[PDB]
Amino acid sequence: WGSIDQINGKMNRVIEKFHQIEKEFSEVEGRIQDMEKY
Amino acid sequence: IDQINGKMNRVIEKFHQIEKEF
Amino acid sequence: GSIDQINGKMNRVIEKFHQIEKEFSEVEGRIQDMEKY
């Protein structure tokens, strides 16, 4: 099960970094929005 | 262990939807 | 100002999206293979 524990870890890290990339994109979006509105 | 497959099917859940989000 | 800044940030975000795609495909592949064999 060290092979499962290991893919559990690989899936967790893919998920964590997607959430970081998602947040970064949100911030970019919100600044396109500032520029467009203000 | 039932415990690490328990997790897997759970972690695998969030992974699958992110697949979709990707 | 804010225009070249967004342009830089967005390009770097897109770069990081392409990295995460490849990593996902590789993790998925490994899960598929564990389940198949």
TrEMBL record, chain B:
GO terms for cellular component: viral envelope. Keywords: Coiled coil, Viral penetration into host cytoplasm, Virus endocytosis by host, Virus entry into host cell. It comes from the Viruses. Signal peptide: none annotated. GO terms for biological process: endocytosis involved in viral entry into host cell; fusion of virus membrane with host plasma membrane. One of its GO terms (molecular function) is host cell surface receptor binding. This is Truncated hemagglutinin. It comes from unidentified influenza virus.
